[model samples]
Target: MKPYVCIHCQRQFADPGALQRHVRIHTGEK
Candidate 1:
């Protein structure tokens, strides 16, 4: 699966998945 790797939280997403088809959320960082 196409894991959506993240650096802020070290998370991943996949199809029909957590790849959230919308917009990027806040990671509590500046």
Candidate 2:
């Protein structure tokens, strides 16, 4: 797996931190 990958939407993020926040939308958490 990549450094930052959104499993819900399957989007790749260069920065893991960015992806973490972005994933919150699908996960309902921050």
Candidate 3:
């Protein structure tokens, strides 16, 4: 499982790839 996730939420990630995707939600622009 990934060591990173939204600390404010209980969401889970299986790996860095998943974390990368999750981080997009916190990023700006495309």
Ranking by TM-score: 2, 3, 1
Q: Which candidate model has the greater lDDT, 1 or 3?
A: 3
Please, what is the whole-model Cα lDDT of each candidate in the order they appear? Answer: 0.49, 0.79, 0.63
Model 1: per-residue lDDT, tens digit, 1-30?
Answer: 557765456666554244343124543232
Compared with the true structure, model 1 gives a TM-score of: 0.30
Cα lDDT of model 2 overall? 0.79
Q: Where does model 3 exceed 4 Å of error?
A: 6-12
Model 3 lDDT, full chain set = 0.63
1-30 in candidate 2: lDDT tens per residue? 556778788888889788878888787855
TM-score-best of 2 and 3 = 2
Taking all chains together, the TM-score of candidate 3 against the true structure is: 0.39
Q: Which 10-residue window of candidate 1 scores lowest in summed lDDT?
A: 21-30
Residue 20's C-alpha lDDT in candidate 2?
A: 74
Winning model by TM-score: 2
Residues 1-30, candidate 3, lDDT per residue (tens digit)? 336665445567667676777777667453
Q: Estimate the TM-score of every prediction.
A: 0.30, 0.54, 0.39
Runs off by more than 4 Å, candidate 1: 15-23, 27-30
